[PDB]
C-alpha cells in the first residue's frame, strides 16, 4: 500500500522485516539451538527454506520499486516499456496471482527476478535517455543555420522507431507520437530561430 506519483501502489515482498527473524532463527538454531518454539520453527523454517529466494524476491522488489517509481514519474516510460512490460508484468502478475503455493514459488521467483531485471534495464535505460533529452530541452538555444541537425533528429527518431521494431511494444505508436512531439517542439524553437535567420 503506497501513495506516490501516478497514484499507484507498490509491490513489496513482506520478507523485508521478516528476514530479521529469519536471521534470528539462523543464529539461534545453528549457533546454540536456543528455546525456539515449534510454531516459530515450523513457520519461519518454511520461510528459511525459501530464504535465498525470499531475499531474491526482496531485491527484485528493490529493483521493481527503483524502476516503477521512475515509471510513475513520467507515463512516457510506462508506454515505452509497455510491450515488453506486458510480458514481464504478465509473468509477474502470474506470480502475484498464486498465493501460498510452495510448489510454484521458486520458478515464479525466478520469473519475477528475470522479468524485473528486463524491466529494470528497459526503464532505467529509457529514463536516462529521457533525462538527457530533458536536459537538452533546457540546453538547446545556441544553434543557427543548420540542416544536418534536422536530418539528424529525423534519423534519430527513425532509429528509435527501428528500436521499437526490434523490441516490439504494444504502445509503440504512442511513443512514436511522443517522439514527434519532441521533434515538433525542438524543431519549432530551432526553426523559429532559423526563421529569424531567414
Amino acid at each position: 500500500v503506497r501513495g506516490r506519483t501516478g497514484n499507484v501502489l507498490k509491490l513489496k515482498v513482506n520478507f523485508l522485516p521478516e528476514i530479521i527473524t529469519l536471521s534470528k532463527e539462523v543464529r539461534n538454531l545453528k549457533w546454540l539451538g536456543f528455546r525456539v518454539p515449534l510454531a516459530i520453527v515450523n513457520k519461519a523454517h518454511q520461510a528459511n527454506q525459501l530464504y535465498p529466494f525470499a531475499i531474491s524476491l526482496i531485491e527484485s522488489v528493490r529493483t521493481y520499486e527503483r524502476t516503477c517509481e521512475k515509471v510513475e514519474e513520467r507515463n512516457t516510460i510506462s508506454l515505452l516499456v509497455a510491450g515488453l512490460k506486458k510480458e514481464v508484468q504478465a509473468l509477474i502478475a502470474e506470480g502475484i496471482a498464486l498465493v501460498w503455493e510452495s510448489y510454484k514459488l521458486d520458478p515464479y521467483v525466478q520469473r519475477l527476478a528475470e522479468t524485473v531485471f528486463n524491466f529494470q534495464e528497459k526503464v532505467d535505460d529509457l529514463l536516462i535517455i529521457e533525462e538527457k533529452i530533458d536536459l537538452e530541452v533546457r540546453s538547446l538555444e545556441t544553434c543557427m543555420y543548420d540542416h544536418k541537425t534536422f536530418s539528424e533528429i529525423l534519423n534519430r527518431v527513425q532509429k528509435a522507431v527501428d528500436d521499437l521494431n526490434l523490441h516490439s511494444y504494444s504502445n509503440l505508436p504512442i511513443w512514436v507520437n511522443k517522439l514527434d512531439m519532441e521533434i515538433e517542439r525542438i524543431l519549432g524553437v530551432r526553426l523559429q530561430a532559423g526563421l529569424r535567420a531567414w
Partner: peptide
C-alpha cells in the same frame, strides 16, 4: 504501472 498494478492486486487478493 496503474492498470497492471490494479490487475495484479485483483489477482493477489
Amino acid at each position: 504501472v496503474f492498470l497492471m498494478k490494479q490487475q495484479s492486486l485483483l489477482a493477489k487478493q
